[PDB]
Design a binder for this molecule. Structure first.
Ligand code: 6N2
Ligand code: 6N2
Ligand code: ZN
Ligand code: ZN
Lengths: 364, 364
């Protein structure tokens, strides 16, 4: 098994489908990564995550370095052994949560729930045993000004080189893991270009598009993807961080994105929102109290084979943990079925038709 | 498959082991019934409940009549179909929660979260599709006086006859379900006797011992069981309601009890308490933060095959739903392994030795 091999099997327009082969397994692209912030995909055993079709999950450097601790996880055998997921794990670098959750120099950032630098982030991700390591970046809030966008971007590019060097200095990491760079530059075409050029000069295994899904709206996000994804190396995976709703994912694939992560299916499942091919529904609504149909009429997941809307409605209204478990399994399974339909339609040269058919029914 | 057939395969002293055959399956005795108050055994899929070894679960008339409603559950196909458990279900009658949770004549009780009578309780349990129906009783708080104990007991005996008649008037219920009477009389030998005599004159499929596990302490509970269980028909199952801790169960079996239910393994599992053969542990304690051993070194459950104390410690301290799921599966599996060891040791004529060996290690 190779360290990291991305192969594009089929294209349609800007959309691609294929595989990333890694030592712990194969990732089918376009891929959706369930988020496992605190070494768990919330309310699911790892076997259940796998059963839904997930090939890879996401963990977070910031959360795990605080609880339970990166050195502690390494002493316990690594994140895979710790949480019981033996397939690839991508770890975000911590740059976003340092900004978004905690309370800043060229060397790095100090904060209160600790210090984080490019070199420390890579070391933490090494200690976790991450398969796809993200470069450590400096994030700026939305809506950023041109000055704050450029200044965050250029520092992020200097930090990308430092991340690259720290990764390459760790023999075990360099031989067994992969490293992705993060393109910044907010909604400004020029800065996105300067960012892409700098990352391509350094050379990474994959290229993430950062700085989106922070409140910009789908139109603007698509506008930025329109010019930003062509700037990235075509022969490497393209990862859109933090995205997103099902229609966001379809449109991002139409624009060249290969990888996705977001908390929406897990978080909104626990809140009562279930995704269906006819759009989301809120299972708490009184109209479901005696609905014997499954959450979705076509879904193949174990929840839709076994339980009714009426039962899940009862569980969520009662605050029952099984409600959260079932909603989450169905939502993650729905997302994986979406990615499967995207992959098959690109492979078959009918993704354009699938996207139109998906949107017409989903927004009917 | 028979409606209800209790067969004692082996005895040792007052202890018995055997089977209850019912239309939806066989119940191995002594049996522990996981509690599924709101049509779910908290944080477990029914398949997981079955995987732990449970033959039967407990539901509650009081909770389900309020949410989601007994007529509604019947319209949706019954409790078994609703929650996805196709094996026997025993429903408590609601008499305890009417007292313990809500805010009283010879006819029945009116309360605020509705009315409950012997006839209405049996009808609700019919609507739920319960396999073992409990007679509706009038409970009195602990510590009851001799006057309040006798008055509650005698009314409960009149209500037991009314429960019997309502059950027998419902042909589908009488042909497919079983009916248990509840012995009351608090800690008073004379009243326990009068209660036992009245129930035996009416005739029931099984006999529950009510009015215990309400704060009386194990010594007093055992003292009451010492004279109360011999009063019940020997050839019928003996159900101790609401009990209990593992040592409570062993001592109750030594005194003739065949069936048990309690929220302890589920509720205290979510609170961080895990049962082991060396006694309970609280997994939140800092001493488990780097403990790679399973919750219990001998346990056969899926949790102890896959995850460490250290990981479960992290989950429970983080408030993660998977923490509750794993603790609960292990605790219910531990209880079922206890019942299995009890059944095997009685069958083999070494239960006395097992009880001594269990207590010496569990309280070491
Ligand atoms: N550049 C990073 N290290 N992280 C990152 C980037 C874009 C994101 N968008 C959201 N949305 C919520 N979360 C994100 C995290
Ligand atoms: N007689 C009934 N219908 N119910 C009943 C009886 C004894 C119990 N003890 C506890 N302990 C908490 N719960 C119990 C429920
Ligand atoms: Zn489903
Ligand atoms: Zn176990």
């Amino acid at each position: 098994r190779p360290r990291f091999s991305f192969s594009i099997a089929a294209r349609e327009g800007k959309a691609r489908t294929g595989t990333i082969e890694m030592k712990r397994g194969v990732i089918r692209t376009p891929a959706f990564m369930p988020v496992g912030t605190a070494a768990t995909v919330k309310a699911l055993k790892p076997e259940t995550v796998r059963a839904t079709g997930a090939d890879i999950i996401l963990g977070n450097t910031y959360h795990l370095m605080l609880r339970p601790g990166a050195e502690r996880i390494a002493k316990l055998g690594g994140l895979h052994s710790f949480m019981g997921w033996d397939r690839p794990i991508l770890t975000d670098s911590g740059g976003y949560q340092v900004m978004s959750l905690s309370s800043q120099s060229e060397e790095g950032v100090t904060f209160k729930s600790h210090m984080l630098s490019p070199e420390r982030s890579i070391e933490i991700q090494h200690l976790l045993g991450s398969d796809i390591v993200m470069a450590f970046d400096e994030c700026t809030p939305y809506p950023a000004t041109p000055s704050r966008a450029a200044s965050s971007m250029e520092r992020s590019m200097r930090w990308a080189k430092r991340s690259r060097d720290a990764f390459d200095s760790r023999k075990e990491q360099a031989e067994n893991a992969a490293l992705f760079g993060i393109q910044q530059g907010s909604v400004f075409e020029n800065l996105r270009q300067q960012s892409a050029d700098a990352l391509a000069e350094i050379g990474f295994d994959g290229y993430a598009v950062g700085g989106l899904a922070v409140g910009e709206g789908q139109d603007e996000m698509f506008r930025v993807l329109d010019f930003s994804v062509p700037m990235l190396p075509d022969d490497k995976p393209h990862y859109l961080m933090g995205v997103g709703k099902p229609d966001d994912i379809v449109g991002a694939v139409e624009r060249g994105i290969d990888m996705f992560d977001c908390v929406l299916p897990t978080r909104s499942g626990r809140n009562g929102q279930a995704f269906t091919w006819d759009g989301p529904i809120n299972i708490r609504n009184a109209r479901f109290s005696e609905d014997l149909k499954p959450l979705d009429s076509e879904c193949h997941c174990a929840v839709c084979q076994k339980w009714s809307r009426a039962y899940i409605h009862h569980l969520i209204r009662a605050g029952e943990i099984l409600g959260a478990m079932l909603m989450t399994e169905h939502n993650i399974a729905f997302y994986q079925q979406l990615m499967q339909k995207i992959r098959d339609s690109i492979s078959e040269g009918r993704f354009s038709q699938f996207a139109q058919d998906f949107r017409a029914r989903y927004f009917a």
